[PDB]
Scaffold this active site. Structure first.
Site, PDB file in Angstrom:
ATOM      1  N   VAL A   1       0.028   4.144  -2.364  1.00 10.72           N
ATOM      2  CA  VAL A   1      -0.153   5.478  -1.904  1.00 10.72           C
ATOM      3  C   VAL A   1       0.846   6.482  -2.661  1.00 10.72           C
ATOM      4  CG1 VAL A   1      -0.186   7.183   0.341  1.00 10.72           C
ATOM      5  CG2 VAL A   1      -1.173   4.858   0.226  1.00 10.72           C
TER       6      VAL A   1
ATOM      7  N   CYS B   1       0.788  -1.058   0.146  1.00 11.19           N
ATOM      8  CA  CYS B   1       0.006   0.140  -0.016  1.00 11.19           C
ATOM      9  C   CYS B   1       0.852   1.314  -0.068  1.00 11.19           C
ATOM     10  CB  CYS B   1      -0.762   0.049   1.309  1.00 11.19           C
ATOM     11  SG  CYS B   1      -0.336  -0.344   2.740  1.00 11.19           S
TER      12      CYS B   1
END
Ligand SMILES: [Fe+3]
Ligand SMILES: [Fe+3]
Ligand SMILES: [Mo]
Ligand SMILES: [Mo]
Ligand SMILES: [Mo]
Ligand SMILES: [Mo]
Ligand SMILES: [Mo]
Ligand SMILES: [Mo]
Ligand SMILES: [Mo]
Ligand SMILES: [Mo]
Ligand SMILES: [S]
Ligand SMILES: [S]
Ligand SMILES: [S]
Ligand SMILES: [S]
Ligand SMILES: [S]
Ligand SMILES: [S]
Lengths: 476, 522, 522, 476
Positions: free
Chosen positions: C156, C152
């Site tokens: 991001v 992640c």
């Protein structure tokens, strides 16, 4: 169609050699309820024809498996080689309360495990020593029975001298039972042999004892072996009506119960076939009257509850109506739930000696019809009772062969079959819902008001089960 | 009383207060029951070592046997032959029991007839029963062959089966050429596995004993396989699978897997599959004959060696890693086929499973019973897993077999605490698991009553049962599973380790008491 | 203390009195623990419907989820390809977790790399990590293919995957020909199933997108099979077997069966079997594409229909009887191969077991959870068995799926008491099994703590766990099982009736109390 | 031999690209106990090389997984998407006594389950609502920690402000922890970040509450996470020796006993790597001395008790000789059973930050030899302590790569490997006994005298298991 049933019977019979054909026609009939004596349409209680795959058992099943084995605080010796006692260990759900191995022994298999030395040389010395070991290792037993297997009387051992000698020695009730499987033609003679054995060796043990406190309402349940708790689902209603059940023969039965039965004022006989002999004896020796009853479904339970109340006084007749009033919403709600799921469905039966007539009413209380019934080992006085309870032009089969029953079911195409373990898996193959009507399919009880709810549940669960729609593949 | 929405069967209905009260009044009113204090006292005593020594001194009484009687085995053997009707010359009660015994284990139909000898035949002999029975059976159920066994009545009065059958052909009750093999199967000799041996030897003799002139060993390139008394469908299947996977030509003599697993497709099939008569007639032309369960195939062995002159391999039952190894190597040796890569990989997935699971199996203590070959293969695999088989019971085991299992146990340190019992029954065993408590029992459903007894002494004394063997009556479809080969080893391994872990979870489920060890990962 | 010949581990060592005494002194002296009366009162509160109402009012807290994150699924998909290394672009803590999570379920090695993006990559992006990472991995572990997914942190921060990989080749960190399919797998979207779908569609594009010009549908006469997220080895194997049993040509796309089941023969094999590269290149030439788990294969479906021009049939997961039937009939429609006698007999055998066990299964109530295709299959099969799927929970489900399961429910009388819940977790399920108690849970190992909770309220409130799903950590080798097809159906049926029967034995083991119903035969 | 190991290193390194080979050589070394500073032989606590299959985890594992997670009466939020909290749910066996879901919460997974909208807009609002919901449904929790996963510091969330505002609005301890997994290079910075969070938000709460009375024998166990009960089999010896163990950090740990820890007389540090930070802080702030000890095996446990006891008066030293005497026959009985079966076997270890050196004495107490050891995330001061413990010319590896460790094992051919769950199933397939030396393979405790017996039984059962003779098929 009475003409079509007669044609079915004749067609099925064509497979037999002439000798079996002639005999088997005598054991098959289209029902005619106006006939006064069943022996004019169907014969019963005969030898099975060899090689035709009868469903029957032997006299040792009828005596050890059925009558003696349920008695819980006695120890029962399967006497002979190791088979009979193993196949019949804990196969029949004659329920009980006790500490098995300690003061109760029902689901245990005690045996003399005959080897060739015992067959060659006699079993009486071995039997003698075995009883000493039983008394040593199971000191809380309240009596020993000796359940003869086929070889006992064939080698001519003397189990009566041993039962007399060792019985005096150790001051205990020891019952020789000559129920060898070659005797008779079925389990039925086992019934009779075991009844006599009770009479000759146990039942008169308190003949000179006035110390029991007899009440005006003392009864005994005769011929309910408490399958899945059947006798308890009946006993509660008898005592809620205001009677005191001194004895249960023989489900959950204790030997003291049996010895106190001659003190009873009325013998309630459920299984006529297996214990009508001792009922007649108690009426003769002790003058105790006896009546038949039926606790399958509410129609028959209500009839019996009031028939039994009538033999007593008004206080019993009054608690009777208070019991029928107590249960009416309970069974009316069962009917309401399950009769819509079952009405008009057709059932065929095959069992031993009572249930092929006694459950008819319970089926009619759910809107189903019995279009075919039959017994393994009933007598003509049983069929007398059956013809009245079955519709006209229905099919009756005595000691049915595997072949006939498969052929009857194939043409008749019932919606449910109620029979035993040896039949169950055959008819499921064919896609016919099947309920075991000896073991209750490990369910029940089916006696009384509480049993009817379970019965209705069990017929519906299987008749309407989703599995029965999926037998043919969607591609053939 | 019942609530229509939630109907109670016997459990838990009879726990209602009004039933409970009624049962109390029956006990106190008329049952003349021993005091609960005396019942508890006697129970505690039956768990002692003093009771154990008295209990092991029985010479006459048997309690809860771990065996059955010969014609049960004969019936099972006969069912493995194509279109064959098992037929037990003798009294009908027996056949009813044989059928229902097998009905409850396999959850299948079991076809078998009697010729229903009664008191009349007990006086003058069952000759007319055999003549009419054979004719009735053939006409009604139309078998290609009728395999004949005997109940103890027939043996005691001594019917001559050969003479009765030959007369039946002579007087025309059945055709001369119709195959009617037979064997004497006295229940008072040996056990159910002895009836399997006698039946197989009889059928083998029928098709080969007088036909040996034209046969020679190895002409058909096959290997005969004799399974013996076998009640797991997966065991017939895994043997046929491994040999086909090897490209080995084989013939499985007595193969009931098909008739014991017919589909539910709207049609009842009395007969399905099975070894054909042609396979039995041709069996002497095989390279050799392997017996999967040699300790109850002694008579079959003598005949296959003495008459077919096959040099029957010394093979243990193919259970566990070592004896499946030896089975495959000998099959490969005899056939000339190599063991394929797919079987070598399967063996390595079993050893991988042993490595994955060895820390939970290490040192676990087992009581166990069953037939002699089953039991010896369980012992060997348990030793291969690093388990300790402390109580080993085989009611129908002989002294030669006991010595051989003794040899196996002395070959590993995990056998140091093991003891072999023969002629002992489940009441003997019950005392052992009380006085020398193992971790688990491995056995048939009669062991559930030992577990019930151990729990009554206390949760700390409970010995859970792991159901492997025969009969298994109180669970569904375990008869489909496998104990032979690497596949049977993987299944036994998975069941054993997960039984240990299920019990450890049970023991650690109590919140704030023992659930510190209620691990998510094991 | 320890007794050296009977060593205790944590359980039961810490039940010794001195440890018990020490732990009570720690509690009373320094823990400032709530009184046991309070703890009891609060626990009781957490079993009530007043508590349940509050519980379902959560919007922000999640407690005991029944899902994992996208990259987990992409790794599992990547491992199904031959000599393929899963490569997660991003932070290395993720890969340690994905490996150990699969390690613990399969009890196998799980090979996967990261490129160890740290705070420097948070600031400056992770292109340097990709260049060196690709080169180090290819050189060190010699994969034939590296299949990239993301953590992640990498999503991001916006790392352009396609550009980084292109720059790796242009600057010569890896050869231009070397296959490096990639997929974005943000863990804050969907769940582990979504990552498998994203990964697979990425690999399918890499090998088919720019070469469709020469593709002819049906040229190779096969059917492609995409299994989706699948953690039962028996399910890869049953599909292949049933297709081979029909003589159907097929391509199983993502097939980790070999690499999750290597033998322990003395060598570690980092790669084994799996889908070939040439199989993906040639997949558009197949007759059609069958998606075994379509409720998490939607991105893959849009691409195979959109780009390969395959007419993917709408089949549910091949679980239970009706859906296995439909699967084989559609396979026959596509392939032209008839359904062979062996599979129709296997089907009849399933039906035979259904008739055998229906009395014990009827009306039994279950709570269950899992991924969407698995859950609906299970619901469908429970209905066919005449059971009641009371609490149906799918944390990673969506409203379109719920609509489909509700109409499955509405079609059967056994679904009258059933509720589907999406986006709810296992602390939600906990309340439901207290307030509307079922007979059993079917679920994964996290269910064990719900069982523990229900027992604490009392033995009569306990809901036993039946372990089917993912992950299973606290039992050994259940990943070898099967849930699909008739074989899976029979395994599930057997487990369910035997769980019912084991529970009834436990409830009737009590001597002179409940053992009147402790039947030998069931 | 030494030069033999040096050539093994260089042949293993041959596979790498230039950049990776030059870096991995700094992290591999042949031991030399005479070297005074380990950084002159082996480099550590640097970034992992990309793509080489490091075994390391991340800073969140070091903080949530390792330090905070075991605190039993607090609720720990895994803040971010659903992965991290689910993979680390109940994976580590930090044992505790409590009623889970009521007053203790260790094995539960609390998470804010970040979806896309929380990434785009931030999760502070979600965290504040989540905190209210936590207070409602778990009212007995004694405080909350917020364990940041990767997105939190990347998207600019301010969990500190949320914790201060909510904490003051709810009169509750709420701890914000910035252990996002992109911070650091390993678990190790999560330890530090976790100690600093205890320091800043918990440890000072009772700096002015004089209500607790200390004794001269008050201690805290610092750095024991009670794996398999380890800290309990440690505590028992300390209190038998007469000390009062006020706190366990953090296995079976309460927040109150953490808050009571500034009152103790001496901090006993097992895990130096993970807890030296806070131990140094309590020395500077509170004056509390700290000392390293070792409870693996008899030799180290006896040494440790004596060196601990020398910090107190003659009465504690007397009790220490009494504890040593009580357990002397027990561990001698362990050594007598198991040392013969393990004498001479060679072990290779690869673990985290402590045990790669700390369990060496335990193996040597069974006659075993540690021929190689290494660490995922250790620092120079760990390798300083390791070179004195390891024998000369043995192999050392820092943040070993998957390929390196497999190649080292293939050449050294150790009799046993002690490493992690990601290593276990590789080396079992190679036929080399393997023991998990994090999870203790679901056994333990291993600390203390009681833990030594289990550790010895476990090394024997696996190294000597019959399965390792079986991996070669007899036909090859
Ligand atoms: Fe494995
Ligand atoms: Fe069946
Ligand atoms: Mo008739
Ligand atoms: Mo009549
Ligand atoms: Mo009567
Ligand atoms: Mo078959
Ligand atoms: Mo495979
Ligand atoms: Mo170095
Ligand atoms: Mo040094
Ligand atoms: Mo220090
Ligand atoms: S029993
Ligand atoms: S008598
Ligand atoms: S065959
Ligand atoms: S394939
Ligand atoms: S939990
Ligand atoms: S703070």
């Amino acid at each position: 169609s009475r003409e079509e049933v007669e044609s079915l019977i004749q067609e099925v019979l064509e497979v037999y050699p002439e000798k079996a054909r002639k005999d088997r026609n005598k054991h098959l009939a289209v029902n005619d309820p106006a006939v006064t004596q069943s022996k004019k349409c169907i014969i019963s209680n005969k030898k099975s024809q060899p090689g035709l795959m009868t469903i029957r058992g032997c006299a040792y099943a009828g005596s050890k498996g059925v009558v003696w084995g349920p008695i819980k605080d006695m120890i029962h010796i399967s006497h002979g080689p190791v088979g009979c006692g193993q196949y019949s260990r804990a196969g029949r759900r004659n329920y009980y309360i006790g500490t098995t191995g300690v003061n109760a022994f029902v689901t245990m298999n005690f045996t003399s495990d005959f080897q060739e030395k015992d067959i060659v040389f006699g079993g009486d010395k071995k039997l003698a020593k075995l009883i000493d070991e039983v008394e040593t290792l199971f000191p809380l037993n309240k009596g020993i029975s000796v359940q003869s297997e086929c070889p006992i009387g064939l080698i001519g051992d003397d189990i009566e001298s041993v039962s007399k000698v060792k019985g005096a020695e150790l001051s205990k009730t020891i019952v020789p039972v000559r129920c060898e499987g070659f005797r008779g033609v079925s389990q039925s003679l086992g019934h009779h042999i075991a009844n006599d054995a009770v009479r000759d060796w146990v039942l008169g043990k308190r003949d000179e004892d006035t110390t029991f406190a007899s009440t005006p309402y003392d009864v005994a349940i005769i011929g309910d072996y408490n399958i899945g708790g059947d006798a308890w689902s009946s006993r509660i209603l008898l005592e809620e009506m205001g009677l005191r059940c001194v004895a249960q023969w023989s489900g959950d039965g204790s030997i003291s119960e049996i010895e106190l039965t001659p003190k009873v004022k009325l013998n309630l006989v459920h299984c006529y076939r297996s214990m009508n002999y001792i009922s007649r004896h108690m009426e003769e020796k002790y003058g105790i009257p006896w009546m038949e009853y039926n606790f399958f479904g509410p129609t028959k339970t209500i009839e019996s509850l009031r028939a039994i109340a009538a033999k007593f006084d008004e206080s019993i007749q009054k608690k009777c109506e208070e019991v029928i009033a107590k249960y009416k919403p309970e069974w009316e709600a069962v009917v309401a739930k399950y009769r819509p799921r079952l009405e008009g469905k057709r059932v065929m039966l095959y069992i031993g000696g009572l249930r092929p007539r006694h459950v008819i009413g319970a089926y009619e209380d759910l809107g189903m019809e019995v279009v075919g019934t039959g017994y393994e080992f009933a007598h003509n006085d049983d069929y007398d009772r059956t013809m009245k309870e079955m519709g006209d032009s229905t099919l009756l089969y005595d000691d049915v062969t595997g072949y006939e029953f498969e052929e009857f079911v194939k043409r008749i195409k019932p919606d449910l079959i109620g029979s035993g373990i040896k039949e169950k898996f055959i008819f499921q193959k064919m896609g016919i819902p099947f309920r075991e009507m000896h073991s209750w399919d490990y369910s029940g009880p089916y006696h009384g008001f509480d049993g009817f709810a379970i019965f209705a549940r069990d017929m519906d669960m299987t008749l309407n089960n989703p599995c029965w729609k999926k037998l043919q593949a969607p591609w053939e | 009383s019942q609530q229509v929405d939630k109907i109670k069967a016997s459990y838990p209905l009879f726990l209602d207060q009004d039933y409970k009260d009624m049962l109390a009044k029956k006990r106190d009113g008329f049952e003349e029951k021993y005091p609960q204090d005396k019942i508890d006292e006697v129970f505690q005593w039956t768990t002692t070592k003093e009771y154990q020594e008295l209990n092991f001194q029985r010479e006459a009484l048997t309690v809860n046997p771990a065996k059955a009687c010969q014609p049960l085995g004969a019936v099972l053997c006969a069912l493995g032959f194509e279109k064959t009707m098992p037929y037990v010359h003798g009294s009908q009660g027996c056949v009813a029991y044989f059928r229902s015994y097998f009905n409850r284990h396999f959850r299948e139909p079991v076809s078998c007839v009697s010729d229903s000898m009664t008191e009349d035949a007990a006086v003058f002999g069952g000759q007319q029963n055999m003549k009419d029975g054979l004719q009735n059976c053939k006409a009604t159920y139309k078998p290609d062959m009728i395999a004949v066994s005997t109940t103890c009545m027939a043996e005691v009065i001594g019917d001559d089966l050969n003479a009765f059958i030959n007369n039946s052909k002579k007087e025309g009750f059945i055709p001369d050429e119709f195959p009617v093999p037979f064997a004497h199967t006295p229940s008072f000799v040996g056990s159910h596995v002895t009836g399997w041996d006698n039946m197989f030897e009889g059928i083998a003799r029928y098709f080969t004993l007088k036909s040996m002139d034209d046969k020679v060993v190895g002409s058909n390139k096959k290997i005969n396989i004799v399974p013996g008394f076998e009640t797991y469908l997966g065991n017939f299947r895994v043997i046929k699978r491994m040999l086909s996977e090897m490209g080995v030509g084989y013939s499985l003599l007595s193969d009931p897997e098909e008739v014991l697993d017919t589909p539910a497709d709207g049609q009842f099939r009395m007969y399905a599959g099975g070894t054909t008569q042609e396979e039995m007639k041709d069996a002497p032309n095989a390279l050799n004959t392997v017996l999967l369960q040699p300790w109850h195939l002694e008579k079959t062995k003598k005949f296959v060696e003495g008459t077919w002159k096959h040099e029957v391999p010394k093979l243990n039952i193919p259970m566990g890693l070592d004896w499946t190894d030896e089975f495959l190597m000998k099959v490969s040796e005899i056939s000339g086929q190599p063991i394929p890569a797919s079987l070598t990989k399967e063996r390595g997935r079993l050893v991988d499973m042993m490595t994955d699971s060895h820390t939970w199996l290490h040192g676990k203590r087992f009581a166990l019973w069953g037939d002699p070959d089953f039991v010896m293969g369980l012992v060997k695999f348990l030793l291969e897993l690093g388990c300790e088989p402390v109580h080993i019971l085989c009611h129908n085991g002989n002294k030669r077999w006991k010595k051989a299992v003794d040899a196996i146990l002395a070959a590993s340190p995990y056998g140091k605490n093991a003891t072999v019992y023969i002629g002992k029954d489940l009441w003997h065993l019950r005392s052992l698991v009380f006085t020398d408590k193992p971790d688990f029992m491995i056995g048939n459903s009669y062991g559930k009553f030992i577990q019930r007894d151990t729990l009554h002494k206390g949760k700390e004394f409970e010995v859970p049962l792991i159901r492997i063997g025969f009969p298994i009556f109180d669970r569904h479809h375990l008869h489909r599973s496998t104990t032979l080969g690497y596949e049977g080893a993987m299944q036994i391994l998975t069941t054993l380790v997960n039984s240990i872990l299920e019990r450890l979870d049970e023991e650690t489920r109590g919140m704030q008491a023992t659930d510190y060890n209620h691990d998510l990962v094991r």
